[PDB]
Amino acid sequence: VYLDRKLLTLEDKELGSGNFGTVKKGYYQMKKVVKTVAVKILKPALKDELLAEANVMQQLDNPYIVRMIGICEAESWMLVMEMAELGPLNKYLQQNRHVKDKNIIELVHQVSMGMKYLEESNFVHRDLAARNVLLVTQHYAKISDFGLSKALRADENYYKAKWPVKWYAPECINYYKFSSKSDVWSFGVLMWEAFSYGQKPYRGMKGSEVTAMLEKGERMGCPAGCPREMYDLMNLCWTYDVENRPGFAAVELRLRNYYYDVVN
Ligand SMILES: Cc1cn(-c2nc(Nc3cc(C)c(OCCO)c(C)c3)ncc2F)cc1CN1CC[C@@H](O)C1
Known part of the structure; x- marks a missing residue:
């Protein structure tokens, strides 16, 4: 050490x-x-x-x-x-627009595997965003930046607390409650970023306006060229109700199936 x-x-x-x-x-x-x-x-x-x-x-x-x-x-x-020589996912994608949806799927699936492992280990990331996914190669991504991460207690499934509000689930904002399901919300935003080739989520909006948008049931649109099934998954990640929102096992499982259907 x-x-x-x-x-x-x-x-x-x-x-x-x-x-x-x-x-x-x-x-x-x-x-x-x-x-x-x-x-x-x-x-x-x-x-x-x-x-x-x-x-x-x-x-x-x-x-x-x-x-x-x-x-x-x-x-x-x-x-x-x-x-990780290639650096942040969002900057890489901004400068490499030729990257194909199949490649992006591959990378977001890799992130979902890392997060599934993190979920099993009962750690909450609390800062999952495309900037905090670093590329070893064009086909190999790693999760970085554990400065806000917390090890959950053996008896709790959440952690009670300058916030990246645009990546945060409602229950984080409303109740200061951070769980692996709230990491799932952030992953949805991360996915949106990836399929937008590193565009900022909620462009030009303040956190309070983002909170207001989400409260009304409004969600970011389906990025250009994003397969409909991947957008479906984003919306599922943006399930308002924490208990009905899926965990990384199910998110990873959906990505895994879809990806290996694309290779078939
Ligand atoms: C805590 C931490 C670890 N790292 C690491 N960076 C890298 N590789 C890397 C990182 C960057 C930012 C990078 O871009 C430099 C600016 O073009 C490149 C080409 C490679 N490899 C391994 C690391 F462990 C970077 C950070 C700083 N974080 C701040 C926001 C997030 O983007 C990264």
Whole structure:
């Protein structure tokens, strides 16, 4: 878990920024091979946020989740993760419009598998969005950014709490209640983004107006070229009633079936 700072080389080129500090590309020397890494580098008591993130990531072990290599303490705190070279899903899709619906299905299914695993592990992501899906290849996606994630208690199926309101289920807004079903809501939004080639959801609207729209039963439209069955799934993810909204097992199962029908 604790990494040697002298085995780590960080590139001066920044990769991304935020109110924690930065993220940078680098290399971690293993026994005989060098591993390319993404390093989240810490700049009041937000130290414990990073350790919590690392603590969540240490427990997760799935192909469709970004792997933690370890933590490094030196000059600043540093969370070392494996590198996904192609970067965020939404930016990739914005710049690669030729990508085919079948490819997008493949990627969203991969995300659904990662989230099904996360659901089984009783973790809530609480920030599932296309920006937080990182591409290893055009055909391999991983879920990133566990800074807001929580391990559910063995007796509860939800967590009670600056929010990405556009990705949030009604019960998150109305009751501050975060569950794997609320991750499912966010996945619907993520799907909409993917099939819109990285377009922003609820363009030009304030959170309060988004909340108002959803309350009236209104939902985002079916993106250009999006198969109707995938849009059906988005709407199912946007089921207002948490209890009737499906879990990731059923969401994943629907994606799996549809995808392997497309390869047949
Ligand atoms: C916590 C964290 C981990 N990572 C990682 N990034 C990468 N690869 C990567 C990331 C970006 C943003 C990226 O785009 C750089 C700007 O074009 C590219 C080409 C690769 N590989 C592995 C990682 F673990 C990135 C972050 C920062 N997040 C902020 C919002 C979300 O987009 C990412």
